[PDB]
Structures are given as structure tokens and as C-alpha cells.
Design a protein around this ligand. Structure first.
Ligand code: A1ACB
Ligand code: A1ACB
Ligand code: CL
Ligand code: CL
Ligand code: CL
Ligand code: CL
Lengths: 4, 123, 123, 4
């Protein structure tokens, strides 16, 4: 999971 | 403020290809010079400008069989159908002309672009 | 010896979401405490272990309406349906418990994992 | 396009  | 799962789109496509390989919920047959290919209308529309136009048509959206132009090569179509469900294109010296012509007919702009580039490198 | 188009899977998912937003070729309604959500069976199966099991069943594969367990929160479902079609999860302090419970019921392992981690950080 |  990432900060888009 | 959303978070994003990097591999989600790839995982979705991988599962859609698993459904295709087991013939689960396929809703159309594409006929290419008597060769038949089963697929999901939504995946075809998501990958091709031609299928997008066909299945948004109020009459054609209901067809279970679509016949392609007789000039379309079944091997070129098979390679492109594989690309649609996997992101992988089996581009070879022996098939590049048939793949490019099929991608132009199917309106798959990124495939047409890589074929033009690979052809230009060989000249 | 294939070549691969990096953005293909993301572009496919983006087009599938455009079809969902315009209600094109949606073939199922998911009912959650009277709230109704239209979707594509194939996308639901590709994202959820529960929908995969439902639509591979020889009788349920033909249903146009699926009713979820009454304990399922419509907002939690909406957030997860949005994630299925976009890879983006709108996870907030106020919805995390409902999102995790809905993801456990839907069998969406990666969502359950990130909810468990975000909950553990707050304790 | 890349070599996968
Ligand atoms: C244009 S809006 C839109 N909405 C939904 C879908 Cl399913 C869709 N597909 C589609 C249209 C055109 C093209 C492709 C896919 C691939 C390509 O090269 N051209 N387009
Ligand atoms: C297992 S083979 C397979 N073949 C095709 C599909 Cl459409 C599918 N979907 C699916 C199954 C289980 C789970 C998910 C999707 C997400 C998750 O967390 N668990 N699985
Ligand atoms: Cl027909
Ligand atoms: Cl393309
Ligand atoms: Cl029904
Ligand atoms: Cl998940």
C-alpha cells in the first residue's frame, strides 16, 4: 500500500 | 486521502485471465476466419476501441457472436487477445505485420505504436 | 520472449470503472440493507473470494440479484466496491471497523491486512 | 513497454  | 494497493490492477487482470482459461462467465465468441475465441465483452471493450464501439451499440451489445473482417489473421487476433488479458505481447519478426494490422483494426493504440517502432528499427 | 506494457492493467481497470459509472454491461445488483449497487460479476469475482465462490456456483452464477448478510454496512460495501474498480481505498478512523468487517466477509485479504495494521498503530 |  502507498500514498498515491 | 485514499491509500492505494500497487498490485491490485495486475491481480484483477490475472484473475480475469484465470476465468478466461476456465471459460467462466465468458459471454461472447469472436469468429476470425472460422477460428473461434471466447472472451468477456467488458475486457474486450476495456482494451479495444473497436469492441468498445460494438458493445455500446444498442443492437450489437446483445449479440453472443461477433464476426471479424475476413482479412483479419486468427494468429494475430490470438496474440492480441492474450495481450488484453495479460499485458504481455508475443511480438516476433514472423507475426509483427499481422499483429500491427490486427491492432489497427481493433483500435489498440499502444500496440500499434510499439509495432511501428519495432518495424522502423529493422529498416 | 514477450514484451510487456506497464500501464495496461491500470488502463483496463480505469475503463472497467468508466463502464461501471455509465452502467454499461453491469449484470448484477448487490443489495446491502436495502441499498443497491450495480456491478460486473467478473470484476466482483476478480476482487473477492466470496463473489468468486458465489458466481462459480452452477445456480447462483445465473442470479441478477445477490443479497448480502444484514450485518453488512452499505457504506463499508461502497468503499470496497470503489476499491475493486480503482485500487484506491478510502480508509478513515470513522469507517475502518466497518471496512475491515466487510472485507473479512467479502474475503479481500489485502484490505483485511491493511485494516489490521492501521488498527494496531492506533492502539 | 519493458522486458518483463
Ligand atoms: C474512451 S472512454 C472508454 N470508456 C470505457 C471503455 Cl471500456 C473504453 N474503451 C476503449 C476505447 C478506445 C480505446 C481503447 C479502449 C483502447 C484504445 O487504444 N482505444 N473507453
Ligand atoms: C483462487 S483462483 C481464482 N481464479 C479466478 C478468480 Cl476470479 C478468483 N478470485 C478470487 C478468489 C479468492 C480471493 C480473491 C479473488 C481476492 C482474495 O483476497 N481472495 N480466484
Ligand atoms: Cl448472436
Ligand atoms: Cl493497446
Ligand atoms: Cl435473480
Ligand atoms: Cl484485497
Amino acid at each position: 500500500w502507498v500514498i498515491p | 486521502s485514499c491509500i492505494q494497493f500497487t498490485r491490485h490492477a495486475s491481480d484483477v487482470l490475472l484473475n480475469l485471465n484465470r476465468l478466461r482459461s476456465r471459460d467462466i462467465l465468458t459471454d461472447v465468441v469472436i469468429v476470425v476466419s472460422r477460428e473461434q475465441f471466447r472472451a468477456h465483452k467488458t475486457v474486450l471493450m476495456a482494451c479495444s476501441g473497436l469492441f468498445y464501439s460494438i458493445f455500446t451499440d444498442q443492437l450489437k451489445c446483445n449479440l453472443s457472436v461477433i464476426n471479424l473482417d475476413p482479412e483479419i489473421n486468427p494468429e494475430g487476433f490470438c496474440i492480441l487477445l492474450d495481450f488484453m488479458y495479460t499485458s504481455r505481447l508475443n511480438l516476433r519478426e514472423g507475426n509483427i505485420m499481422a499483429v500491427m494490422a490486427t491492432a489497427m483494426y481493433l483500435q489498440m493504440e499502444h500496440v500499434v505504436d510499439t509495432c511501428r517502432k519495432f518495424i522502423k528499427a529493422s529498416e
